[PDB]
Every structure is written in structure tokens, then in C-alpha cells.
Amino acid sequence: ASIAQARKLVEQLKMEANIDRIKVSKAAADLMAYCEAHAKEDPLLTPVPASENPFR
Amino acid sequence: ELDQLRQEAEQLKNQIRDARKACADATLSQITNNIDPVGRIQMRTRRTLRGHLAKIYAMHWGTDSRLLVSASQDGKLIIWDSYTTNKVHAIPLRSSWVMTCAYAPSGNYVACGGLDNICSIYNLKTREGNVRVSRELAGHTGYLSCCRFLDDNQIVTSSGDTTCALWDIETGQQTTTFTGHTGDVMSLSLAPDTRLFVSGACDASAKLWDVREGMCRQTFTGHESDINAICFFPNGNAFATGSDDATCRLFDLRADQELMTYSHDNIICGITSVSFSKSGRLLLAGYDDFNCNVWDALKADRAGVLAGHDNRVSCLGVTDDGMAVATGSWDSFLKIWN
Amino acid sequence: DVQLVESGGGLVQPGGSRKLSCSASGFAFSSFGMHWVRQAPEKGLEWVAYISSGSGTIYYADTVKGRFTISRDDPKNTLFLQMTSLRSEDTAMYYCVRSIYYYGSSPFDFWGQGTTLTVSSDIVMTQATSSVPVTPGESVSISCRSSKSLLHSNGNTYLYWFLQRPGQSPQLLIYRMSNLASGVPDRFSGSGSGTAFTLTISRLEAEDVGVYYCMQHLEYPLTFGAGTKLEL
Amino acid sequence: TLSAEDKAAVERSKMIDRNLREDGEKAAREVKLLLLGAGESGKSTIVKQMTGIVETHFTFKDLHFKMFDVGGQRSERKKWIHCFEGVTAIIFCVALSDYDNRMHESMKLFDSICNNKWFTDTSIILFLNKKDLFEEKIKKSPLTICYPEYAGSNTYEEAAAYIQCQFEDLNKRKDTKEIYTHFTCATDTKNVQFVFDAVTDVIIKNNLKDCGLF
């Protein structure tokens, strides 16, 4: 009855236990670094002037 | 015997959550306390794409950042030219109940689906000059909630089943089936490399899938209700989800944990769609309240509001070049903000 | 498959009238705008008239304004060119050309075989070279120049390159001077600066010999150049 | 300031606009009906009288209906029920013989549908199938097994009226929407006639609201 999904989910949990996962600090720092690095080429952040804005 | 199985399931969950708690040395609110606030983001309705006569349930930009497809339950899937507000095509769907739409990266094909259980594929470029249905992918037992092309030949779809599926468009069979969820899968974001894709389900969980082995890499929890939307951070190593509880959550794959919650006391309604700016510093989120809030993704401060809609903002889209953001709502309009 | 067949040509006394009919099949004829293009004997192509999809807009050449009338009717998938007061220099083999206008489209993609008619008892496009001999294997370049810059403000240029093999209708090679038309081998390529344009063929297989024409689509009347002939 | 091709593209866009307008006008011709109900065959008989969505188009007395059946969707209703916000009406099929209970779950479904936020003003066309089989069961076994609080005789008419009252009183908002009821074992044109009458009343209400008279 429930034996099937029971084995499937316990194996799922076992597999998810075996993950090489990193500290939150460095991952957050990496995400911040990407946000800041690509800032200049993000039109949404800086209001792009109408000279090269395809939307008027 | 089932009690013992529940027992080591519980102890595995305890161990996993203990490790995840161990990894949580800090949060974005700490290390991002020093960055400059993004400031008010004043966006104006540069375009108001009109022509749909019913609710717009899904839209999707094209890789050229100019052509966008939008699907409405009037029975139409309109291919629009964003720059000139022109309608390049208007595909009449066989089934009007459409709640997803895709535009192929090559731009040759579009896809749509909904309560019919069929992911229709429409060939835009044909010798006859009219858009013709090329392949109807059938096999799901539940409504198609999301669908994204991987190539001209492969497509990954999420259904009202507990399952997603990768389909070979040429032959029509399910190349792969993703089974792990326990509730309706409502959204599906394809990683930039397309190797992996995330899927948020009504079991309040977002699962990470590997396309070429049909196996769930990771499961993310923390939402209080069903997840309606999901989108990768442009890295492809992180993604943001929105649920019927008035919060968005930013999950990171490598840390395998929830990072940031985007919530406010004023907002007491669900999130219908979510999107990231090109750089990822802005998180766009459409809401049941007739608005799209722009969140400072690093500080969780609300950076602005796109208030120009008369109904739920069902769908969002940010171009690849990040020049404009398209919001489609149930008022049947499709506004381009910049 | 898409097919355009013209009929109604023949010998007509000058001063007479005749209607050319173009039967279309294999494609959504109503979606496409249609053009008529004469080619007098041993002469380059010359645009005649234009009928938009839905019969909304009409255009004519100044040399046929008033005398000719372009019309269509979608239900029977047919195009018509009524012709009146036929003068001597209307002797030509008329082509029925298909053309769809939307973003990223390929106008003038398909040309009908064409019907011959013998009457008997503005941007100027220039091509300097003609009767250019080429042995197969190497590459060649053909040049076409325009009196007015074909680069529009919106940012897409409007030169079209066509190839006409002997005894066969011309076919679209390049549209908007960069985009390779569907089904054309990759060896063909287009380039140029807004007033002078060139098309280059990398490898010249004998099948591609014939006359190459350049046409402007910036503004009506559309004007072809005197095509450059490539021969073995 | 527009190239020739741009003008042609604008003309094509206008053609698409007029085609969409005509399609929308034709769509407004339709009457959208959402079919719901417990039982694997209760709504099947009604569909006969007239996976995923199956649509049964039919024109009756010059009025073109469009009935959509959601019985094949084994998924959470609240995620896709809002797709039918603008549905002209909801046909709700319940078998009277299910009082063995299945009828209580049918009552729960009717409560969740009638009082749904989206269906604030979409009238419900209630059908009570199997009145002959209900007659057989009610002269076999009493209805008290289903409704212990039932305080009426064993007669068919009293039981039918009681069931109708129990289903109708689930409507908490009587000032905005109406419940049209019908015992649908007639197996004749009376079912299509009844749904046509209910739809005519709904259209008259919608026209009164649109004209500002209601």
C-alpha cells in the first residue's frame, strides 16, 4: 500500500542528505557581487536616456 | 512496518534541516546592510498593447527583446511587436482555456497549454505564411500550468498532475517524466543553461530538476501556501518564488536554503508572477492587488510600484537585454514599462 | 507546395486591352500582398503594381498609372492585372510576385513562372557590371548602387537581391541586404553601406549562373536595377 | 517617417485588429456554462441530453451555448476555477439516489462553489438527477439515514422538497445570485428548455445591470 512511496521518499531524503552545500555567507556575497557587477548594463536600474531608449 | 519507514524518514529530515541550520551563518540582510539603497524606481507606461478581449494569463518575451507572445482566454495567442505595438500574429487556439504560453528561443515556434492537458506547438515560420499547429503534446492528466522551450525539438512542461515532463516535439512522446511532487505544479522556470529547471507546486515546495536524468536534485520549503510563480536569478544558481501568502522568497541552490523574504504588512494578497531584472538587483512581482511591486532584491526594501492596472497582474516578463518590463493583467491590457 | 501560375498573355494589337490572371495555390493567399513585375525581352525587371492584403492600399508605376488596374479576389485565390490602351513598350513577360509584410518577414519570397505578352501589329538603382565571366569554384561579388540612402530611421535597410536563372522565374536571395531568404544556400551573403551595396557568392556552382537584380523597397515606386549577368 | 514595409505592417496589424474584434463579437454571442457535479455518470446523462475540458457546443432556440465539463480535472479546483469567472452560469448536477454519504459531499461541493468569491453573481442551475431511482430508494429505505434531522414523511414529494431546500439554503448571498432547480429525469427537451429559460433570465439580469437598471 504505502510501502512503495515510503521507500521512494526515504531514498529521496537519503539522496538529498548527500549534497555538498556551502555557507550562506559566501553564496549571498556571490549574489551581491553579480548584482553589483552587472549594474551598469541594467537599463531598469539607471533610467536610460531617450537618445538610445527604444521606448518613448 | 510503515511506522519504521516514517521513523527514518523523520530522522533523515531532522539531519537535513540540522545541516541546513548549520550552514545559515548569516543572511543577505547582514552582509547587504552596507550597500547603497536602489532608491525609488519611477517607471512609466511606455506602451499599452491592446487587442485582447479577455484575461491575459501568460506572456513571454522573445530572445530579440522585441517580439512577445501573450495568451488570453478569449481564445487567442497574439504575437506582438513591442516597439511599434503591432500585432505580428494572432493564433486562434483550439481550446480557449490557456494558462501558459512559450516563445521558442529561436523564435520559430510558440507553445501554449491549459485545462486541455495538451501542450500545443505552433510553427510561426511556414511556407504557407500562416501559423500552423505543428505538434500537440498529450499525456498529462492535469492542466498545463507552465511550459518552456529548451530547443526547437524539446520542451519542458508542468501540469496539474504532481509531475512535470520533458517532451520530444518531433516524435511527441514524453522523453522524461518528473514525479516527485505531492501537489499541483503551478510554475516552471528554465535555467539559463537549460540543464536544470525549478518547479513550484501547491504543496508549498519548489523542486529542482535535472533534465537529462529525470531526478529531483533538491527541495525547497518555507512558503505557507501554494507557489504560483518561480524564476531563476540570472546566475542560474538561485531562484525566487511567490505564493498566495503575501511573500516572495529567494532560494539559493548551492546553499540549499531560503535567503530572503519579500513581505510587507500592507500586502495581504498572493503573488501571481515574479521576475528578475537583467542584473538581478530588482525583483519584479505581480500581485492580486492591482499592482506590480518592484523589490530591492538585496535589501528586501520595496523600490517602487507599477500601479497602472485595473485587475490582477497575472504575468510578468523582463527582456533579455532588460530594456523594459511587460506586465499582463486580467484587465486584458499588456503594458510595457521602462 | 506554393505555386503561382499566370495566364492571359498572348498577341494583342496595340491600343487593345487584356486581363492577366494569376492563380495561386499552396499558401494563405489572403494574407499576402501581391506585386506585378514586367520583364521586357532582354531587359531587366520592372515593378508594375502592388495590391496589399485586404486590398487596402494600391500602388502603380508612373508608366502604368491610369492604364493598368491591379485587383484580386481572395475566395478563389486569384490576382488580376487589367490592362488597357496597351502601348508598344508593354511587350513583356509579367511575373506574379508574392510578398508578406511584418516584422522579420521575407517580401518577394516567391515568384510565379510568368506569362508572356506581345503588343505588336524615384530612386534609381544602378549596376555597373554585366556579362561577368566566372569559372566555378571561386567567389564573386556583384555591386548595386542607389541614388538615395536606403537605410531608414527605424534601422533596417531595404535592398532585395534576386537571382534569375535562364528560362526560369527570379527567386529571392537576400531581403534587407543581410537576411538570407529561406531555402537559399548559405554561400550567398549581402553587405554594404547605406548607399552602395554588394552581394557575394562564395562558391559558384554552375546551377547559380544567371542574372542578379537589386531592388529598393524604401518607398514606392519600387525600382530594379539592370541585373548583372554571371555566366560560366 | 514610416517606411513602406512599416506602413504595410501597420496595415496587417489593423487587419488583425478587425479580425480580433469580429472574433470577440462572435464570442460574446456564446453562453458559457460550467458543468459540475459528483457522480461518475450523473452529469453524463445531462451531457447526453445535450481528459481535461470537454466542450459540448449546441444551439437551442437560436441561442448558442458552450458547456464545459471539468469532471476530468483531478486537480485542486481553486487554482483554475477563476478561469470561469465570466461564465454565464453553472450547471450543478447531483444524483438524488446518492443519499445512501455521497450526497453530503455533493452538498459540500455546492457550498464551496456557490459561495466561492469568483461566483458572487453567477447563477447556479441545479439539477437533481435520478428522481425515479430516488423514488425506488425512498420507498425502499428512508431518507433519515442521510438527514437525521429530517422531520418529514417518507413520501417522494416531501423528500424532494426537503433536498431542494437543503441545497438552496447553502446560498449565503441571496441578493446577488439565484439558484434555479430542476428534477432532471424527464429525459426529454425539458432539460434544454429549463437551462435555456435560466440562461434567458441571467441574460436579462446582466442587461439590466449593464443598462444601469439594477
Add this chain to the structure above:
Amino acid sequence: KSMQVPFSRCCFSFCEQEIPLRAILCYRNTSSICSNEGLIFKLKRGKEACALDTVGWVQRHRKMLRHCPSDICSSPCDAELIQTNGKLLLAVFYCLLFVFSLLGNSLVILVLVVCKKLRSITDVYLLNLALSDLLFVFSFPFQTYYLLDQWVFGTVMCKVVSGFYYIGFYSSMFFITLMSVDRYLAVVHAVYALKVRTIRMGTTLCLAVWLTAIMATIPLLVFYQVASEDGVLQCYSFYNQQTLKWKIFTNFKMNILGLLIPFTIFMFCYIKILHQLKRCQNHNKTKAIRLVLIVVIASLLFWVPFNVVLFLTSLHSMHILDGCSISQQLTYATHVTEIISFTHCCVNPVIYAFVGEKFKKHLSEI
């Protein structure tokens, strides 16, 4: 002093004495509008006398007497007797009604355009009715000035203001008729109404309404002129000095084309709607009955009295009715019924827009 009543000095009585020959005695023609013709003498004793037999002894005198800008039996008769206080009351009514109608119609047009986006054919009719009412009320300040002072805006402005007045009147008539027809079609013929009630049909019918209103107005537009009658500048149908014939034509044209056919259709439609709602009493649609009754009663209240008094003025002009008392009472009645009809511009938004629950929701939203 109004679009329908010029200040005319008349003669409705005759003195038979043929040699009142010694006075300042300077003569005047009766106003062109006036039906009885005649001549007026102004005597040095201040009394003015009537010479309705304009020819004969009096023509000999006319070439023995002179014209003048500014016992004998009877005096010339002024068409209007309203004193300063009455004109003040009419003027304040005009001003307050102008501002109320202006704000009401502006609010209707604003909300109907920006909040409704004209998604219904009923919205199309309501928008065009509001525009018609605006066009009509644009003539009110000119009416206040014209009532309290002579006309100084010139012939072109006289024609333009008459155009506003009559286009507004006819367009309002036909738009309320179209709304009545639409309600009849959508209540008594709902099944068939689905096949014909669309935005395109409403737009086409409303351009038809505008074109027919223009067609009705052009004759009145050309007839109107500014004339220095009796030392007062007056904007009225003085074209070719046939003011009587033009008055009769305008009265009967407005009567027929504004009341007879429009209200015929209007009452037929709303009577059938009321019968239908009486048929639906098992559902108790009382509110619709109340609103249709309110609309019908209001329309009749501010249109029927004005039209009947115009018809009576027409009868007077055709000599069916004669005398000062009838004439002065008719001018007074025209001045008050014109006020009450002007109330239509401010009441049409009332009875058609704010009483509807479709509309108050977006009013509260703003």
C-alpha cells in the same frame, strides 16, 4: 429675450380715427415676428397708438411723417412683461443650472471614458447623451446675457449659439429614444439582442443621430440672425424678415421631430419593459420598475410642457389665438418651461447614471 422669444412690441388692437395729425407723432413698424402687422405712432402725450391698417390714410401720413430709432383708443402691446426681479430669478436659475449641468456631464464623461472604457453599447449612448447635454448647456451664459442685456456677440455667434442649442436639443431627444429602444431590445428581446447589440452598432446609430440632428438644425442655423428690433439687438430668426414663417416652422419642427416620434418610441419601449417586469413578478424586480418610472416621468416632466407651450405659441402666431393677455402669458410660460427643459441637462446624468449600481461603484472608487 431668449432663443425662442424675442422682445417684440406688437399691436393687437385698432383705432379708427384717421387724423391724429399734430404731435411729435413719429412712426414705427411693428416687429417682424409679430403676426398682426400694423404701424405704431408715438404721440407727444406719451401715449402710443396703433394703426393695424398699415395702408391708407396712415401711408399718406407715413410719407408726411418720419421714422425714429431710440383721444386715441389703444396702445402697442409688449410681448414680455417680466420685471427686473423675474429676470434676475431666471438669470440665477440659468447660471446655477449651467454650472450644475456642466459639472454633472463632465463627471459622467470623465468616469465613463477613464473608468468604464466604453465597454458597453449603453455606455456609448450615455457618453453621446452627455456630449449632447454639454453642447446644449454651452448656450446658457449667452442666454443670461441676452436676457439681462441685448445681444453683442454678432451674427456669427448668434448662428453658432443657435446651432449649439438646437443640436443639443435634437441630439438629446434622439439619444434618449435610442436608449429606450436599446432597453426594449435588451429586456424583451434578449435572445435576439445578443445578435445585434454591439459597440459597432451603437457607434453607427449614434453617428446617424448626429447627422440627423445636423440635418434638422441647418435650416434653423441659416435662419437665425441678429437684428436691431425696437432699439434692442436680438438673436432670432430674422432672415429675410420672414420671422413669422420661420417661427411657425421651428415650432412645428421641434414639436414633431422632438416630441411626437421620439416620445412615441420612448413610451412604447418603456411600456413594454414595464409589462415584461410585471411578468417577472415571481422574481420581484421592483427596483427596475421604479427606475423606468422615474426616467419616464422625468423625461415627460421637462419635455412635454415646453413642447405644448411652443405649440400654443405656434397657434397664436397662426392667429388661432389672439390678444395681449395670451401673448404675454405665452412668453412667460416659454421662459419658465424653457428653464424646466434646461433642467434636462442636469437631470439626465441623474436619472441615467448615478441611479445605476453599475456606475456608483466606480464613482466611489475615484
